[PDB]
UniProtKB/Swiss-Prot annotation:
Subunit structure: Homomultimerizes. There are several thousands of this protein in the phage capsid.
Function per UniProt: Self assembles to form a helical capsid wrapping up the viral genomic DNA. The capsid displays a filamentous structure with a length of 760-1950 nm and a width of 6-8 nm. The virion assembly and budding take place at the host inner membrane.
Location of the protein in the cell: Virion; Host membrane
Membrane topology category: Single-pass type I membrane protein
Shown part of the complete sequence: 37 to 82 of 82
Keywords: Capsid protein, Helical capsid protein, Host membrane, Membrane, Signal, Transmembrane, Transmembrane helix, Virion
Residue ranges crossing the lipid bilayer per the database entry: 22-42
Location (main, coarse): virion
A cellular component annotation (GO) from this entry: host cell membrane
Family per similarity comment: Belongs to the inovirus capsid protein family.
Coiled-coil blocks: none
Stated name of the protein: Capsid protein G8P
Residue intervals on the Periplasmic side: 1-21
Length: 46
C-alpha cells in the first residue's frame, strides 16, 4: 504494498487524475470548434 503505491496514489491522482480534466477540458472544448464548423457550413452552405 500500500505504501509502495502511496506516493503513486497521490502523484497518480494529482497527475493521472488531472488527465481526465485535460482530456475532458480539451475534448469538451473541441465541441466549440465543431459548432463553428457546422455553423459556417449552414451559413455558408445556405
Amino acid at each position: 504494498g500500500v505504501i509502495d503505491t502511496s506516493a503513486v496514489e497521490s502523484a497518480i491522482t494529482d497527475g493521472q487524475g488531472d488527465m481526465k480534466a485535460i482530456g475532458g477540458y480539451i475534448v469538451g472544448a473541441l465541441v466549440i470548434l465543431a459548432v463553428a464548423g457546422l455553423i459556417y457550413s449552414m451559413l455558408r452552405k445556405a
